[PDB]
């Protein structure tokens, strides 16, 4: 992949994978995503255990599933994992919603 462009619409479901992790989650992994304008950046984990209608949920295989990505959910998805070999796997996927910003406040 490496910087993959993914288009989506407000209220549309979207799923992303974290390059590096196999079918099942081996060791601990840290995911980070930047959305909004600057104060929306949040850290994704292998266990969201939270409301999907508000944000999204994390798959057991180490993936990410969203029920409906809103215009505010727009941003960039970045994942980082580490294998037993010592090397780490990087994953960057840019996501764009329907409506876009122009003059925020």
């Amino acid at each position: 992949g490496s910087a993959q462009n993914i288009t989506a619409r407000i209220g549309e479901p979207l799923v992303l994978k974290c390059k590096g992790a196999p079918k099942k989650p081996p060791q601990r992994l840290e995911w980070k995503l930047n959305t909004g304008r600057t104060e929306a950046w949040k850290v994704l984990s292998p266990q969201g255990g939270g409301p999907w209608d508000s944000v999204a949920r994390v798959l057991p295989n180490g993936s990410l599933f969203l029920p409906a990505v809103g215009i505010q959910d727009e941003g960039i998805f970045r994942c980082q994992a580490m294998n037993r070999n010592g090397k780490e796997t990087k994953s960057n996927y840019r996501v764009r919603v329907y409506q876009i910003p122009g003059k925020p406040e």
Binding site: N5, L33, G75, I76, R94
Partner: peptide, 7 residues
Amino acid sequence: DEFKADE
């Protein structure tokens, strides 16, 4: 500017 990604 926008994470790793950049166009």
